[PDB]
Structure formats: C-alpha cells, structure tokens
Amino acid sequence: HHGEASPVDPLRPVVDASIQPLLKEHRIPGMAVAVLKDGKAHYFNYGVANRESGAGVSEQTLFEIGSVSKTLTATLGAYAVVKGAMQLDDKASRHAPWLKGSAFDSITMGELATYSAGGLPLQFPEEVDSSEKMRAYYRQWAPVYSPGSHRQYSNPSIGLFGHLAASSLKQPFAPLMEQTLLPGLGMHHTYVNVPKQAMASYAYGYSKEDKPIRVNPGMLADEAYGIKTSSADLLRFVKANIGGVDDKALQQAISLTHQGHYSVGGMTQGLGWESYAYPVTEQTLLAGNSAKVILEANPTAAPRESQVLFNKTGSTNGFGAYVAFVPARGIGIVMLANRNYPIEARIKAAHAILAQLA
Numbered sequence: 001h002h003g004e005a006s007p008v009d010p011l012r013p014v015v016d017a018s019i020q021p022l023l024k025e026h027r028i029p030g031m032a033v034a035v036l037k038d039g040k041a042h043y044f045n046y047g048v049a050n051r052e053s054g055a056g057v058s059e060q061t062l063f064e065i066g067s068v069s070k071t072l073t074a075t076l077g078a079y080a081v082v083k084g085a086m087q088l089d090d091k092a093s094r095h096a097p098w099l100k101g102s103a104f105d106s107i108t109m110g111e112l113a114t115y116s117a118g119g120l121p122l123q124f125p126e127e128v129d130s131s132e133k134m135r136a137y138y139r140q141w142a143p144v145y146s147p148g149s150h151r152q153y154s155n156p157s158i159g160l161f162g163h164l165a166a167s168s169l170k171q172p173f174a175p176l177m178e179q180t181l182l183p184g185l186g187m188h189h190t191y192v193n194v195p196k197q198a199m200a201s202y203a204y205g206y207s208k209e210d211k212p213i214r215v216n217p218g219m220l221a222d223e224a225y226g227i228k229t230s231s232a233d234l235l236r237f238v239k240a241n242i243g244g245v246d247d248k249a250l251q252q253a254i255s256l257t258h259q260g261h262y263s264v265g266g267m268t269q270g271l272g273w274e275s276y277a278y279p280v281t282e283q284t285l286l287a288g289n290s291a292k293v294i295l296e297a298n299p300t301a302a303p304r305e306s307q308v309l310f311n312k313t314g315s316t317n318g319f320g321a322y323v324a325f326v327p328a329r330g331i332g333i334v335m336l337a338n339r340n341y342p343i344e345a346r347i348k349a350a351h352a353i354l355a356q357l358a
C-alpha cells in the first residue's frame, strides 16, 4: 500500500508491533483488537473473518470467545446473589431437587463457580450428551478432593453454577442472558445463540488444518463457553467492569465478580475473572495461565487482599480470545482471533501492549 496515508491513531504503532508478528507466526486468518485508554475505545482489525466471503474483520465481527463466556456466566450468578435468589454458600442441591442425596448436598454454589468442588474434570465425559445423561453424571460423581481444597478448572463445574443460578431466577439460562444480563451491560451485539439477522457478522474459526469450523453443541455449552461477541461489545463489558452500569443490581453483581476467593501462585480466583497484583511480571501472568494451572489440580491458598489486573482466556477448536484490564489505570485490551493459537502468545502480546498504555 505504498503512497496511502497511514492511519492517524497514535496507538496503532504499539498495537501493530505486538499483533502483526503474532498473525504471521501462528498463521491467524483474522483478529479484532480493541483497546481502552483515557476513557476512549480504539479498534484495530486484521485479516479476514470468513475466507469464503473474503470479508475483513471489524469491531462488529462476531467471534466465539470460548471460556471468556465464564465471566458473563459468573456475572449472571452474581446477579442472582444480588437479587436474593441465592447465596454463594448455599449447597448446590438447594437449587436442584434432582441433586438431593448426592455429594452436591455438601458442595456450595461458590465452590462450583470457582472450580473447587473437589475434582470435577475439565470436560464432561464424551458419553454425557443429553440433559438426562447429565443429571445421571452428577448424581454418580465421586469427589476426589474435599470441597474448597483444590482448583481443577472445569466446564461441568462452572456450567452447573450457571445452570442452577438461572434456575434460582426461574428462567432458562440463554433467555436470561440475552434478555436481561447482556442488555444491562450494554452488549447489544452479544449472543448465546446468534440470530438470523446477525449470522452474516459471525466469523468462521479455522483449525490447524485450516478447515472452517464453529463450536459444537455440548452439555452446558451456553454456560461454559458458548458466547459469541464482537471486540466492541467485549470492550463495553470491560468498561462496565471499570466505571459500572446504570442497572443497580447489575452494578453490585459486577463488583461481586471481582472479589477474591483463593489464590494459586500469583493468581487469585474471583467469580469468572482471575486477578493479579498490578503491575504484574510477564512470568507471573504466564504462570497463572499455564498448562499446570489450566489442566491439573492445584491446592487453594489464601486470596490476595482486596491496583489489580483482571483477565480471562477463552478458546474453542477454531477461536482464541483474551481480555485483560486494569481498573485503577483505566486501561484494557480485548483480542479476538479465529484461530486457537497458544495462550502464551496472547499473554506476551497483551502484556506488552498494556505496559505501553500505562
């Protein structure tokens, strides 16, 4: 593009410098990046959302955000607490009569939400593919560790939290999210189920073999990893986590998601969000989002006392997302890609960029 005026945004060089090497090293088809600094949103877009249409990524493009969905599910659960429909210390079986008589008689909602129920696995067994089979699974599940003693990152765990929280509010999860929570957060281009008039904005994800894919139906997918959103809407969620929102209950719920429950190394587990003392070393950020913390059971330690960085990774077969923000400095970044590229690469880039914004 020799001879064209280069974009005027003073932040473009900093973002490009971190993001462009990323796109070529890991062959990422497209990425939407959004940055907050000094009360203003900046969007930087790269590549293609859909190789069939050849359409470019924009801040309106919908990506699967995988486990970043857990921050929204956590916020819904916090909302149920604010509204008085449940408490984090409730036994899970209080919100599900079909759980009475199982181990979930003695496991709290809080423990489900923070993956510390006692060894619930990362994914459901592949056999569990219906509501009836799901219920049977939980009723037979044998705890591996005592409640609260270990963190084992788990979709069945946070998934069950979201499900029972919606049930305490007497509405199914997806309509509760789409009709109550998301609008109150000002996320009007965010969906559990992408409707027809929004399907055109929905990117394709691309596998390692560069085949187009989107997330597969699974049990509690909505609760655990099912949100589609744009970079602009996710940046709005970041702003909601910094400056707040007009709905008073939703305001409280947001604050509740920031409260620490326990730590693993330098990472403190909140509801959905994971947090760090800021400024934070790259090695600490890397460690808290490492395979060790993600895949294996880790003992819970005392939470960090209440400047803080909040983050959450999210991945599906075809997508890779990351969000991090620092309320005390009014900075944040959202990175949404349609390839599942390594978590370490996301953190290194985000960390580099945030440091410049600060």
Ligand SMILES: O=c1[nH]cnc2c1ncn2[C@@H]1O[C@H](COP(=O)(O)O)[C@@H](O)[C@H]1O
Binding pocket: 066, 067, 068, 122, 123, 294, 313, 314, 315, 316, 340, 343
């Ligand atoms: O079932 C699994 N087995 C092994 N790794 C997984 C599984 N599910 C997700 N992951 C990976 O675990 C990491 C954390 O996922 P995230 O929290 O959704 O970003 C990502 O690298 C995922 O691709």
